[PDB]
Ligand binder design. Structure first.
Ligand SMILES: CCCCCCCCCCCCCCCCCC(=O)OC[C@H](COP(=O)([O-])OCC(O)COP(=O)([O-])OC[C@@H](COC(=O)CCCCCCCCCCCCCCCCC)OC(=O)CCCCCCCCCCCCCCCCC)OC(=O)CCCCCCCCCCCCCCCCC
Ligand SMILES: COC1=C(OC)C(=O)C(C/C=C(/C)CC/C=C(/C)CC/C=C(\C)CC/C=C(\C)CC/C=C(/C)CC/C=C(\C)CC/C=C(/C)CC/C=C(\C)CC/C=C(\C)CCC=C(C)C)=C(C)C1=O
Ligand SMILES: CCCCCCCCCCCCCCCCCC(=O)OC[C@H](COP(=O)([O-])OCC[N+](C)(C)C)OC(=O)CCCCCCCCCCCCCCCCC
Ligand code: SF4
Ligand code: SF4
Ligand code: SF4
Lengths: 318, 188, 176, 45, 155, 115
């Protein structure tokens, strides 16, 4: 029945990715004195399906100057990573329990950029290359601290396994102990997904659509899920990382309800941030992080290695 | 039948017509997808004389204005006749796609045309279509042609990149007309 | 007089410096924005649902034209060509003729709704209140030809919206 | 009769605010750091 | 009968299109500014399904709103050619419906239709943000009434 | 067993999505539709010419930074050693050196953009 589990972790997510679009439209609208989609079915609950069919029956544009083989690999690579990087998440009991969960988290998160990379190159245009290279610049500043914050926070968890995160957070939230890191992790998770103040790669007002300029119909529709499935999964990563809920050993219902609510609350804040602030500049973004973020990471990581030894509070390895 | 019902009905007899959405140049251009380019007996025994679309369009317009088009039967044909193999050589040279001709017996191509007819959408190649590619344009000099109307035929060599610029990859997209030499023409 | 706008030098007292340091370190004006939008999230949306309810207008609104007619039924237009002479877009095209009764009406009154810009000068022009834009802002058509109105369509609009034009003009005939 | 226009009421009109009314709220800078450290100490403990 | 299943698939496809058509970010002149008021919270175009996506590669209906002139007419038709199929063009305002106020000038094409196959014509100078709000919904009815597969099953 | 089954299932589902996306919608290509997008007008003509970006120096340093993030990753297992005195000194060396490399990288311009 393991295959049934695989679809049960894919299809329910896919509808969750679908309804994030409708929720974002309504959340953004109601934060705008607007109403949001409410004509497609009741309360606009049919809107994602309305856009769903249109895109997959939309004319999938093939640009002549594009390199076709690389053109099609990028949407496949973007979506494939998005789903497969859900599998180590410890929703009560993780689907794929591995001793190095967070390392696998970073690996496919780092693999994700090659979607916007190859697509940006294959589109063969000015706005295509501008978006792809600033996508390098946005993400080049990005893995260096993402690993450090992950290392510093987990250093008192005990290991890289995602399941044991719950045992560490059994008594109090992780955010109580590393709130300076949590704010900094949250900005980066807001940043790794190219969202809200850091959306240079898309840049509607300044790059029309960036990498997505020559991407229509399903090839576009695929790009939307990869972006939005990464939003939910990264927030779920933050929810377990910093706000690990209680887990009854006999009723996984309790953790599942609490964990999902935490992901919903965090994902709304992603839309909350997306509505409020303006958009940075890709030079300021890099300057913000390698001049202000990265120096704080090293000292905070310095603090979070010295702290367990000085307090005789090192965590068990097994 | 139409001539019987309408005696003074000008009948226009165009040869194969090439243009942007022609399904004639695009037909051979699209043939690259299915491996090589299959021509029966290498297509070396089939001479075609295509005509550009606009000339026949101006032919119809001039025929309407002309007070002598009543009853006549015009045959709209191009300037030069090309053997089919050289024509496909010209097309793939203009598109710069590799040419991989290979012989194919007539009965087997008919079978291939049958398989393609199964599609419930716009067919790509029917058994009837396979026959047409084999049908060489019969010369009808007694039939009043195109120059009598006044329209001068445009050789396919001039306005060939229009149809085939789209089929070129990004590599040879900006290549001009003079890059590919004019194909040999078996003339009357 | 004039007011300087932004040169406010911040104080360098330890309380002020720590306040700015707390602001930069612990993002506050960013949180001030978030609290702002959240407060502006639980308001009442300003939207109105379409045609079930429609936006508010005024009696002097300018829209689709109509050629009214007297209470007797006779058309108001005596074809004085004033509206054509004042039309900024030259959309008015009329020709008159001595009608069979002897009255002075127009054979043709094509108004090109694709040229004129709804100045309203025409309703100000004719001294018999003949041409007047109706309140109907909605007459969008699927083909370009439908917008080119002739005299017959104008009279039909006059016969359809006559209740509104009589009431609206009744309200605003004193302001002008 | 009596000339009637859209003249303002006899008492003119109510005072209209135009100056900036940006409120100031929040704890003192020292307090923000103090409570922030307090949670850290509790979290470590 | 195959007609029934074709009609059911017919209704499914167009309903997706009419409830998810995305007007491009294509504004020209005075006629464009009030169209923002349609997107403003007063009328809230987005509530009816539309989103104002740029990049004609990812748009359905083109709101030609403003004076169409000579120097830009090549740019528009290049833009229209880039839009995938299906694509609709609503000529919005009197300037794009034949030339508007400047019908007789020297650098304006008298009518957006002379460059593009122009769909439903919404008049006004400018049309009220609501006036073409019906214009968008009236196009949604045009999308509703198409046949497409019905013709294909009977072709 | 499970891991590549999970991997295979995901690429398969993606392939079908693009397959029905790229085949079903009744294409109609007319050359200018496939022409590159250049904000309404024609492209000047390039997009493969060398896009000289100005963060080249910050680019390679990121590679050097990652090379040492791999070094400091075994810390969770390194803390479970019998010689924390040595482990703490060597650990703090890496962060001190990483800050030092950045500090030189910062002070001698470096991080700043090239104009
Ligand atoms: C490493 C393996 C590389 C294999 C290889 O030759 O890749 C060519 C491949 C296609 O190059 P392109 O720049 O898209 O140009 C394709 C046409 O020449 C130009 O575009 P096109 O639209 O003419 O492409 C259609 C063309 C070429 O076929 C394709 O484009 C189909 C996809 C590639 C098939 C090989 O079809 C044919 O020639 C007939 C095929 C029967 O180039 C790559 O970089 C793809 C590598 C993929 C490796 C595996 C990834 C997982
Ligand atoms: C110049 O002129 C201009 C105008 O006018 C001419 C204007 O008016 C305006 C004013 C209008 C405005 C709206 C203001 C903002 C507009 C701008 C252009 C300003 C710049 C914009 C930005 C900076 C922000 C851009 C934000 C965007 C685009 C929002 C993106 C996010 C969303 C949630 C919305 C989009 C949602 C979509 C598309 C729906 C979901 C997507 C799908 C593909 C549908 C779901 C599909 C599936 C599930 C796939 C199928 C699978 C299924 C069903 C599963 C089952 C089956 C299986 C086989 C598994 C402006 C500004 C203007 O400048
Ligand atoms: C998930 C979506 C499930 C439902 C998909 C339904 C199929 C939609 C395909 C796109 C529209 C074309 C179609 O329906 O039939 C193709 C048919 C193909 O045959 P056709 O002849 O009608 O195509 C249009 C006309 N030409 C060929 C000139 C372009 O086209 C139409 O129905 C459009 C009319
Ligand atoms: S409304 Fe103004 S522009 Fe239009 S026809 Fe009347 S006078 Fe001419
Ligand atoms: S509509 Fe008015 S201005 Fe025009 S001809 Fe008639 S009376 Fe004169
Ligand atoms: S139709 Fe009127 S409002 Fe619209 S652009 Fe032209 S002049 Fe301006």
């Amino acid at each position: 029945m393991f295959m049934i589990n695989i679809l049960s972790l894919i299809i329910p997510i896919l509808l969750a990715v679908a309804f994030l679009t409708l929720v974002e439209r309504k959340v953004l609208g109601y934060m705008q004195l607007r109403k949001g989609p409410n004509v497609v079915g009741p309360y606009g609950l049919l809107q994602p399906i309305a856009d769903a069919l249109k895109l997959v029956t939309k004319e999938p544009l093939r640009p002549g100057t594009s390199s076709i083989s690389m053109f099609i690999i990028a949407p496949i690579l973007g979506l494939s990573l998005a789903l497969t990087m859900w599998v180590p998440l410890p929703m009560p009991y993780p689907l794929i329990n591995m001793n190095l969960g967070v390392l696998f988290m970073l690996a496919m998160s780092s693999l994700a950029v090659y979607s916007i990379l190859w697509s940006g190159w294959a589109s063969n245009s000015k706005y295509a290359l501008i978006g792809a290279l600033r996508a390098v610049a946005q993400t080049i500043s990005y893995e260096v601290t993402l690993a450090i914050i992950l290392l510093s926070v987990l250093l008192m968890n005990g290991s890289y396994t995602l399941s044991t995160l719950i045992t560490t957070q059994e008594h109090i939230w992780m955010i109580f102990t590393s709130w300076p890191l949590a704010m900094m992790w949250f900005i980066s998770t807001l940043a790794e997904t190219n969202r809200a103040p850091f959306d240079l790669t898309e840049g509607e007002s300044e790059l029309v659509s960036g990498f997505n300029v020559e991407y229509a119909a399903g090839p576009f529709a695929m790009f939307f899920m990869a972006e939005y499935a990464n939003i939910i999964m990264m927030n779920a990563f933050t929810a377990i990382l910093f706000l690990g809920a209680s887990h009854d050993p006999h009723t996984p219902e309790l953790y599942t309800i609490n964990f999902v609510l935490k992901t919903l609350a965090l994902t709304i804040t992603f839309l909350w941030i997306r509505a409020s602030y303006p958009r940075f500049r890709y030079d300021q973004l890099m300057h913000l992080l390698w001049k202000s973020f990265l120096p704080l990471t090293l000292a905070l990581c310095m603090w979070h290695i010295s702290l367990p030894i000085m307090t005789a509070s090192i965590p068990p390895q097994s | 039948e139409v001539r019987a019902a309408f005696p003074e009905a000008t009948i226009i007899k165009p040869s194969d017509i090439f243009g942007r959405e022609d399904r004639f140049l695009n037909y051979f251009a699209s043939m690259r997808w299915f491996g090589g380019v299959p021509l029966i007996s290498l297509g070396k025994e089939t001479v075609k004389q295509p005509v550009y679309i606009v000339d026949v369009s101006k032919g119809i317009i001039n025929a309407i204005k002309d007070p002598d088009a009543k009853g006549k039967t015009f045959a709209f044909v191009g300037p030069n006749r090309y053997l089919l193999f050289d024509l496909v050589q010209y097309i793939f040279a203009v598109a710069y796609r590799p040419f991989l001709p290979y012989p194919l017996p007539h009965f087997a191509y008919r079978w291939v045309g049958r398989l393609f007819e199964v599609s419930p959408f716009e067919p790509w190649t029917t058994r009837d279509k396979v026959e047409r590619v084999h049908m060489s344009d019969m010369t009808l000099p007694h039939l009043p042609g195109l120059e009598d109307l006044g329209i001068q035929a445009t050789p396919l060599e001039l306005k060939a990149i229009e149809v085939l610029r789209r089929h070129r990859t990004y590599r040879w997209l900006t290549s001009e007309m003079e890059d590919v030499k004019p194909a040999k023409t078996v003339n009357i | 007089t004039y007011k300087f706008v932004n040169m406010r030098e911040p104080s360098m007292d330890m309380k002020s410096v720590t306040d700015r340091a707390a602001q930069t370190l612990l993002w506050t004006e960013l949180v001030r924005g978030l609290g702002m939008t959240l407060s502006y999230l639980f308001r009442e949306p300003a939207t109105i649902n379409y045609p079930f309810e429609k936006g508010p207008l005024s009696p002097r609104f300018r829209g689709e034209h109509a050629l009214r007619r007297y209470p007797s039924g006779e058309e108001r237009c005596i074809a004085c060509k004033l509206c054509e002479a004042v039309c900024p877009a030259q959309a008015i095209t009329i020709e008159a003729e001595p009608r069979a009764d002897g009255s002075r009406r127009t054979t043709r009154y094509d108004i090109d709704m694709t040229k004129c810009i709804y100045c309203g000068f025409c309703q100000e022009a004719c001294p018999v209140d003949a041409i007047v834009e109706g309140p109907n802002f909605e007459f969008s058509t699927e083909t370009h030809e439908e917008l080119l109105y002739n005299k017959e369509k104008l009279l039909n609009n006059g016969d359809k919206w006559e209740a509104e034009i009589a009431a609206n003009i009744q309200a605003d005939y004193l302001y002008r | 009769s009596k000339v009637k226009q859209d003249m303002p009421p006899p008492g003119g009109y109510g005072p209209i605010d135009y100056k900036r009314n940006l409120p100031r709220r929040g704890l003192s800078g020292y307090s923000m750091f103090a409570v922030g450290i307090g949670t850290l100490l509790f979290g470590y403990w | 009968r195959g007609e029934y299943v074709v009609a059911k698939l017919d209704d499914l496809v167009n309903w997706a299109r009419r409830s998810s058509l995305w007007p491009m970010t294509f504004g020209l002149a005075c006629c464009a500014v009030e169209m923002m008021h349609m997107a403003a919270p007063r009328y809230d175009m987005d509530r009816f399904g539309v989103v104002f996506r740029a990049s004609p590669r990812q748009s359905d209906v083109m709101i030609v709103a403003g004076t169409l002139t000579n120097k830009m007419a090549p740019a528009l038709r290049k833009v229209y050619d880039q839009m995938p199929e299906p694509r609709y063009v609503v000529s919005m305002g009197s300037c794009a419906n034949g030339g508007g106020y400047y019908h007789y000038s020297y650098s304006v094409v008298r009518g957006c239709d002379r460059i593009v196959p122009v769909d439903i014509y919404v008049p006004g100078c400018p049309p009220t943000a609501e006036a073409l709000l019906y214009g968008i919904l009236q196009l949604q009815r045009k999308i509703k009434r198409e046949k497409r597969l019905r013709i294909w099953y009977r072709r | 067993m499970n891991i590549m089954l999970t991997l295979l299932t995901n690429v398969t589902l993606a392939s079908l999505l693009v397959l029905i996306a790229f085949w079903l919608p009744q294409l109609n290509a007319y050359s200018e539709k496939t022409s590159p997008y250049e904000c309404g007008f024609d492209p000047m003509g390039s997009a493969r010419l060398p896009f000289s970006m100005k963060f080249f120096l910050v680019a390679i340093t990121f590679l050097l930074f990652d090379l040492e993030i791999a070094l400091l990753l075994p810390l969770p297992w390194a803390s479970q050693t019998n010689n924390l005195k040595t482990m703490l000194t060597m650990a703090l060396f890496l962060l001190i050196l990483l800050a030092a490399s950045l500090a030189y990288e910062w002070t001698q311009k470096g991080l700043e953009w090239a104009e």
